[model samples]
Target: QNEGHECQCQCGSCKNNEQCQKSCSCPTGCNSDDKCPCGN
Candidate 1:
């Protein structure tokens, strides 16, 4: 199942990956301090 982009962030209800992509510059929610999937 190719969704064009990759699931770089935590696979869950929150679409923080969008924010993670720009905020973290790594597409990982863990990099961010707020609403992070990895609970950073």
Candidate 2:
């Protein structure tokens, strides 16, 4: 999916890419859950 790259992804999981039927070492899941935008 890299021809002229820009379709950037982080956690757009199709269930983590269908249970990581994966190719590259592509896992960068660090944007925490429950909508915590670090503001209180």
Best of the candidates, lDDT: 1
Worst 10 residues of 1 by lDDT: 22-31
Clashes of 1: 0
Stretches of candidate 2 exceeding 4 Å from the true structure: 1-15, 27-40
Instruction: Give the TM-score (vs. native) of candidate 2.
Output: 0.16
Over 1-40, each residue of candidate 1 has an lDDT whose tens digit, in order, gives: 2223433554442345353333333243233336443322
lDDT tens readout by residue for model 2, 1-40 = 2123221234455224543324323233324444322111
Off by over 4 Å in 1: 1-4, 14-40
**Per-residue error at 17 for model 1, in Å?**
12
| Pairs in steric clash, model 2 | none
Candidate models: Cα lDDT each:
0.37, 0.32
